[PDB]
Design a protein around this ligand. Structure first.
Ligand SMILES: CCCCCCCC/C=C\CCCCCCCC(=O)OC[C@H](O)CO
Ligand SMILES: CCCCCCCC/C=C\CCCCCCCC(=O)OC[C@H](O)CO
Ligand SMILES: NS(=O)(=O)c1cccc2c1c([N+](=O)[O-])cc1[nH]c(=O)c(=O)[nH]c12
Ligand SMILES: NS(=O)(=O)c1cccc2c1c([N+](=O)[O-])cc1[nH]c(=O)c(=O)[nH]c12
Ligand SMILES: NS(=O)(=O)c1cccc2c1c([N+](=O)[O-])cc1[nH]c(=O)c(=O)[nH]c12
Ligand SMILES: NS(=O)(=O)c1cccc2c1c([N+](=O)[O-])cc1[nH]c(=O)c(=O)[nH]c12
Lengths: 162, 396, 393, 396, 393, 162
């Protein structure tokens, strides 16, 4: 009953992370520049739709960690394997070491995501101020859910063992 | 006839030069300097510009002089009041007056500005010597507590002195009289180190000091990090080549065998290379021009250290010099009165872009606190790893 | 006798409903009351008349044709004149001036600093918004990891491990300490995180208040002399700019040296439009003028200006009648009779202030006010949680 | 013949006056003012001092004038360049020139200096409004905790919220979910109040501001604490008596019915009374003399607010005035050039005792912390009293 | 040829054991080496001779009797002269000056700031000694009263109640809390005492370091112009004070305005005795002189002086021979031959520096060093207490 | 045995307080001025021995508390009654409420003395610095003893009751 609720939240957190890296609405800078992560899209001026890739280039090492979205993509790979691990526990039951594995990956997904947020704010900063777009909070909302999915996975592992 | 040459601060063509024909077409230091000379000399001055656009040097092939120097010897120009360096070979051909201002070769660099705080920038208030002393001391207090006692083991004693320094109340307390002498003394250390940190960090954010990386010519002789050179061929380039003392001989070794060659065609190209590089290239030229460039817009370079050589400008007059005697004496009197210092203060300092310093405390950004965040999440991931293998080995 | 006067602000202005007014009842102001007092003391009936030219008094350099108030006096269309007119060496020769009644000076006029009401949440200024966001995320991630490694095949439950993480950051000790190695190592880093974040907040707020209290406003003319951010300019032409040219003073020679060379035109043509330029800038431009006119501009019209500092120049207004007049005797003594008894001082108090339309350095309650709203809101939820779980059981 | 009068800043007899006989015997503002007048007037000046040592006033009994005014009307003195006030009765007897400087009646007080911190001087950082709000709130949180719970009673709940604000960890912890919402919210309050205190106290000891107790004439009209008066009989004393406006009419009510009478014989006695009283007596005199006394040694008084009345000094000349016309016009020209402002800046400001402000942070003395020591020992003595009667009543 | 020179510091001074020396081997210095270089380039043997008068060169206003180095040249006792002598309009007429070889200027000389070694206990500066005394007395009185009211007809023994009082002040939580009302009330006041004393110490130390870092030394002549605490004076008579009188400059006219009227005599007669007055004051008096003499005074003799700021005045030394001399030609060009190749620059480096007898802003270890001695001493007693109670049982 | 040690310390603390208020050696100020509490005695100058009483006169209230040494004299009266109370327990034994009373007075003596020190330093303070004389530390040493005598008195009261 509660184990079935875990699968829905796993796919939900997997979705919101996939929408985040897809949509180009993470930041605004000045006319209006609705830039995401990989492609900077301009609006209100000469070219209205004509977009192009980002030209990025101790200080050298952080640049390549931003240029390649290494942490947030890893978070999704940990997350989708997590939901797969719960489905692997449904069939061939009574293993007593199935959902435990998934629980660690969901916690690791958030701990991978939380770095990706810190790196992005560190890279952006070097007078009109920047504002955070809707698709950024999608990454913020996904962290909270995955953490809640993580603790749920621990409760089921305790129940079967005891 | 008064022969001069077009410079940046000395001879400037005024705005609406077509509207005003005569001596109103130009304005500068060298124009007013000629009027001060003709105040005690009975001569009629006419602002005539040399057509060549050259100071004066005898060519290797032709063996003939050009420009203001060429017009003097061949007999065309009467008087020459212009920024002209007084060298050995010039004295052989034409007579020179006494120096009216002194100059030399100096160092210029881009303004120091403000640095970006990267990672572990929060360990700035205290020296690197103190941090390591706290690490060693904490082991000593933990080890002594165990030996004093003989519950408190090696692992349990280390935790007590960690929780003590972080200033959080645990359930671990030494019950021995000997142990309570150790505990109370270690507590007083914790109280002063925390209070001293907070005080020194407050001083950093009240007044900010931007200090120069290089001080002297001997400083950039040892540092050997920032590139430095001169013009492709000039007066300062010829000075570097033939040097007796070892400090400039080691500098010419760098200047010659540079990868790539640090030489620019024009003096205007040298200034542009310093600002664009941003603390990567340092240019060497006359201290006179350097001080003028610093005062002009938009102010992003400054003079550093003393001068290396000592040269001077004078008033040039053709060979024989029938009218060169009185004007030489007149300048020496105007030097004493303080008219040369008054005129140099008018064009350099008075007419400038940047002159009040008002500081405003800004909110702390995440980039300067980023260091402690990496330590947190890094420590969390390590705790999961140790807990897993502790269970894995206990299972078998 | 006939009175020659000029219309300018509170000295002389036409009465309300001037269509239904005849004679001296058609005008009202300061000089109106002055003309009434002297005419009684000397003893002659008068008739008020406005000037033809509308100028103060200036002679053309070519033809000596005096235009304004003094021009009407030279040939003699009116007997005497009562108008705000300064005394000069040039004016003293052609027209005979009496003893001064009101003293004037050149003063400074800046935009009035608005009552800076502190933000209801002006206590979260030291740390930026994106930091406060990442402290919340970290707090969640720390407790979840602590919960996991604590109980493994334990007092640190999902409720208790969440309570431990708050107590550490708030610096309020602890109830139970982690017993295992895995629980201790994650507890030690969270203690190191807390100590730096708190000490950085206190030190930054210390720097914020230290700077804010050691700032001085533009008080004297010496403060103007050593400032480039706040610009200052006078009228295009007058007695103010003419004084600045042949100014043999300490640092007022350097003041005009800056005034001559500016990026935009600092010298304004109109005085009233010049007052608007100070409003538009909002603490970026200052306007120099007479002290008498400056004090009246603060009172009448919307309040966004004030006088600051002492008077710089020395100049006095007077009452003029052409030389070879027998009216000099009784009038000059009557002016001294008004001043010594205190008739002018009572009258100057009326038209400026009485007829006007304007008017501890500890930590305030408003700066901390925000954190009280957090305290009450928390107790509001606390009552609701007690309401829910009582109906359940 | 040039008649003058001996003053403090105007006419001063120079040192070695026996050695130099003539116009070298004296030096001041009024001496140079006469030389500026005779620059545009064909007259021979001789520094002659009036023998009476009086300005000029017609006696009630004799009905005859004295001093410089008496010498003018009876025909002895030719010209009078001295600090002489231009009033109504003087204009009837002798003709006066145009004013060369303007003055008025102003307020002077002893320098504010630094105050002694007595007891409870440590509650300075925060307002008295905030302190009482913390007291009320602490009861509210304690009472709500008890009602939320229904071990925690009335006495036990009050202790928890006291130990919470002092930031010491006890053994009392709310176990209810509802109580842990109360606890954590009360904790965040404690963290900000302590941090805000420490920051504001640091600002007080970095830069110290000594602010004046009185600002204007209407300020000491309401305050009515510090004594204020004038000379026994003079120009400013006669001004106070006959007043139309209510603010000075209320001031003359105080000045007349003073206990005791606040009037001194000489102006020198008035300055001495202000410095000795130390913020207890405020003297009222001319703004001219007041500004000179502030600049002179050892600097312990300053001018405050604006002037009340507007008077001026001029050059006096006998009745008829055949030579009074040209010198009246000459002063008006020298007023425009800025020679009067230049000369006043030389004797007042240039020649002075006190002009760099360097501040140094001193160690804290026991007197400024004394407040918290009385509270400690007072609280200890109270604890012994309650413990005794708690045992005494339990015994019976 | 014969050389006329004057004896003054490193230019010309007699050689060691001058009794056993004959001719040019009787002298040694800078000008000695200069005389050797030019005599070879031009081509003539020389004989060094000291001046008769012992002055630089000045003419009496009555009789034109030139006394010093230039006086010996006018009638012609010697051929040429090599001495540190400045060029003037007055000197240029009677004697012919050559091109300058060394440039001089007027600079500032102050007492060298001594290496301020911090006190080994310079961390107990914020609070005075009599406060630290009364904290110890209070600590005893608090525990004794707590001990009394706690146990009365209890965990708070005489040993445990003493341990509770330390843990409260050090801000390290508590093991056991007072249970009774009498024990709680005395515990609450000791908590209120602790919070104020600690917060007052941190805030005072914050103010102590903030002030100490925002102080600037006397760098430029502008810093001298706006200072009254640190006095500055020149020689009684010379070319320095004569320049100051007819100084038409920015703020050097105000500098001499202060110099004229001083309490003691700021003008010193002797230059060497004037250097002693700077030593005696110790950062209270400054002495203005030539830059060349200032740099040499730092090197030779005990080190308690230094040059600070840039050069103010422009003046140059020269080599003089009377007008109508055929020696002007080869010498003037030889001077330019020495300077351009770099003979003077190598020689000036030798006699000043080579022949000389002198030569991060975080919290230092020395400032905290004292509190480490308290840590070790405590562990020393801790070992002794373990040594005593082991022999007993 | 330990009760006999209490009497010696009671008379010792009583003595040191009496010597303190007797001898005029509490402070030095500049030639040399060896001032005590009631009489300011001068040395090294014109008058060498000729001494005179002190001319003293919210701020008004502290002045009279210094002028009359109200606290340190009270401390001695509490102390000498304490030692008397111990002697009153020697004869007519087994009362079970004798030394208890004395113990409170010794604690009260120190808590009275500690005020007298704070008041004296507050009054003195308003460049050569003041130095504390030997007879001041006599008052400091007496506080420590009386506190030790106080705690000893409690131990005897516990022993007889139990
Ligand atoms: C450790 C757990 C404690 C974490 C508790 C976090 C504190 C709450 C933060 C913001 C309240 C929302 C404020 C919204 C009201 C708008 C006005 C405002 O306060 O603006 C914020 C801005 O940063 C300044 O102006
Ligand atoms: C709560 C219990 C903790 C109380 C612990 C008190 C700390 C020890 C005080 C002084 C050490 C003696 C220092 C003597 C050495 C002489 C040099 C010195 O430190 O001088 C002191 C002066 O105040 C500055 O210079
Ligand atoms: N513009 S520059 O960078 O500073 C500069 C560079 C190189 C040679 C210069 C020179 C200047 N100058 O100051 O205009 C004057 C000058 N006069 C001479 O007689 C000579 O030979 N060379 C020069
Ligand atoms: N309106 S204004 O801005 O203040 C003003 C500006 C400019 C000149 C003024 C003037 C006033 N005034 O006070 O009306 C009076 C006045 N009187 C004279 O005699 C004279 O020459 N110039 C003026
Ligand atoms: N010394 S004082 O305190 O300021 C002063 C006090 C009282 C009357 C004064 C007076 C001065 N004065 O400035 O020397 C000048 C002056 N001139 C007059 O004509 C007159 O009637 N009374 C006075
Ligand atoms: N010894 S000194 O203190 O520095 C010094 C003090 C005063 C005048 C000097 C002088 C020196 N000097 O450098 O030896 C050279 C020099 N040369 C001149 O021609 C002249 O007129 N005056 C001087």
């Amino acid at each position: 009953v509660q184990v079935l609720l875990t699968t829905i939240g796993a796919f939900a957190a997997f979705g919101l992370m996939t929408i985040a890296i897809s949509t180009d609405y993470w930041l605004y800078t000045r006319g209006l520049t609705h830039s995401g992560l990989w492609r900077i899209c301009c609006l209100e001026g000469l070219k209205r739709g004509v977009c192009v890739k980002i030209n990025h280039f101790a200080e050298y090492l952080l640049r390549v960690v931003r240029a390649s979205s290494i942490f947030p993509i890893l978070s999704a790979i940990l997350l989708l394997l997590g939901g797969v691990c719960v489905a692997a526990s449904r069939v061939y039951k009574s293993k007593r070491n199935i959902i435990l594995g998934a629980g660690i990956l969901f916690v690791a997904a958030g701990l991978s995501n939380i770095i990706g947020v810190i790196v992005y704010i560190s890279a952006n900063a070097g007078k009109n101020h920047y504002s955070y777009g809707w698709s950024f909070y999608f990454g913020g909302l996904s962290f909270i859910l995955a953490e809640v999915i993580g603790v749920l996975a621990v409760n089921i592992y305790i129940e079967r063992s005891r | 006839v008064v022969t001069t040459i077009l410079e940046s601060p000395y001879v400037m063509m005024k705005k609406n030069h077509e509207m005003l024909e005569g001596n109103e077409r130009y304005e500068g230091y060298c124009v007013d300097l000629a009027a001060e000379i003709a105040k005690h000399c009975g001569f009629k001055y006419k602002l005539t510009i040399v057509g060549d656009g050259k100071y004066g040097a005898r060519d290797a092939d032709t063996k003939i002089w050009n420009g203001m120097v060429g017009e003097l010897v061949y007999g065309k120009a009467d008087i020459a009041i212009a920024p002209l360096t007084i060298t050995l070979v010039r004295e052989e051909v034409i007579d020179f007056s006494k120096p009216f201002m002194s100059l030399g070769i100096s160092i210029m660099i881009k303004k120091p500005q403000k640095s970006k705080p990267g990672v572990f920038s929060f360990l700035d208030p205290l020296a690197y010597e103190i941090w390591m002393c706290i690490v060693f001391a904490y082991i000593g207090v933990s080890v002594v507590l165990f030996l004093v006692s003989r519950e408190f083991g090696i692992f349990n004693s280390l935790w007590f002195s960690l929780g003590a320094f972080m200033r959080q109340g645990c359930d671990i307390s030494p019950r021995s009289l000997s142990g309570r002498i150790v505990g109370g003394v270690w507590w007083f250390f914790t109280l002063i180190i925390i209070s001293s940190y907070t005080a020194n960090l407050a001083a950093f954010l009240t007044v900010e000091r931007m200090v120069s990386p290089i001080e002297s010519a001997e400083d950039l002789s040892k540092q050997t990090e920032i590139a430095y050179g001169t013009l492709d061929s000039g007066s300062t380039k010829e000075f570097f080549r033939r040097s007796k003392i070892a400090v400039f001989d080691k500098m010419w070794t760098y200047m010659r065998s540079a990868e790539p060659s640090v030489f620019v065609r024009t003096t205007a190209e040298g200034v542009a290379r310093v600002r664009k590089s941003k603390g990567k290239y340092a240019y060497l030229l006359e201290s006179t021009m350097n001080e003028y460039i610093e005062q002009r817009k938009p102010c992003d370079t400054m003079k550093v250290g003393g001068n290396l050589d000592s040269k001077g400008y004078g008033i040039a007059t053709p060979k024989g010099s029938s009218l060169g005697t009185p004007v030489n004496l007149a300048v020496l009197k105007l030097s004493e009165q303080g008219v040369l210092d008054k005129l140099k203060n008018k064009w350099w300092y008075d007419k400038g872009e940047c002159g009040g310093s008002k500081e405003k405390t800004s909110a702390l950004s995440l980039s300067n606190v980023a260091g402690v965040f990496y330590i947190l999440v890094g420590g969390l991931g390590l705790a999961m790893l140790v807990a897993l293998i502790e269970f894995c080995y206990k299972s078998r | 006798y006939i009175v020659t006067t000029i219309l300018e602000d509170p000295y002389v202005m036409l009465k309300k409903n001037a269509n239904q007014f005849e004679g001296n009842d058609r005008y009202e102001g300061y000089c109106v009351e002055l003309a009434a007092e002297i005419a009684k003391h000397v003893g002659y009936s008068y008739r008020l008349e406005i000037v033809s030219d509308g100028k103060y008094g200036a002679r053309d350099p070519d033809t000596k044709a005096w235009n304004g108030m003094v021009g009407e006096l030279v040939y003699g269309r009116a007997d005497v004149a009562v108008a705000p007119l300064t005394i000069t060496l040039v004016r003293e020769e052609v027209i005979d001036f009496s003893k001064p009644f009101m003293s004037l000076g050149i003063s400074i006029m800046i935009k009035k600093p608005q009552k800076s009401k502190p933000g209801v949440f002006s206590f979260l200024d030291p740390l930026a918004y994106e930091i406060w966001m990442c402290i919340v995320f970290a707090y969640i991630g720390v407790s979840v990891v602590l919960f996991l490694v604590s109980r493994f095949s334990n007092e640190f439950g999902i409720f208790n491990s969440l309570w431990f993480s708050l107590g550490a950051f708030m610096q309020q000790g602890c109830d139970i300490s982690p017993r295992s190695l895995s629980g201790r190592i994650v507890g030690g880093v969270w203690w190191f995180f807390t100590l730096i974040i708190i000490s950085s907040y206190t030190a930054n707020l210390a720097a914020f208040l230290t700077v804010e209290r050691m700032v001085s406003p533009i008080e004297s003319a010496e403060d103007l002399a050593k400032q480039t951010e706040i610009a200052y300019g006078t009228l295009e032409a007058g007695s103010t700019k003419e004084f600045f040219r042949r100014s043999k003073i300490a640092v007022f020679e350097k003041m005009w040296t800056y005034m001559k060379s500016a990026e935009p035109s600092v010298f304004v043509r109109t005085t009233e439009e010049g007052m608007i330029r100070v409003r538009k800038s909002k603490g970026k431009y200052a306007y120099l003028l007479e002290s008498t006119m400056n004090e009246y501009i603060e009172q009448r019209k919307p309040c966004d200006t004030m006088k600051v500092g002492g008077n710089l120049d020395s100049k006095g207004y007077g009452i003029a009648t052409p030389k070879g007049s027998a009216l000099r005797g009784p009038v000059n003594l009557a002016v001294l009779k008004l001043s010594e008894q205190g008739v002018l001082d009572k009258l100057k108090s009326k038209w400026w202030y009485d007829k006007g339309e304007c008017g501890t350095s500890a930590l305030s309650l408003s700066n901390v006010a925000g954190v009280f709203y957090i305290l009450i809101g928390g107790l509001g939820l606390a009552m609701l949680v007690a309401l829910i779980e009582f109906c359940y059981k």
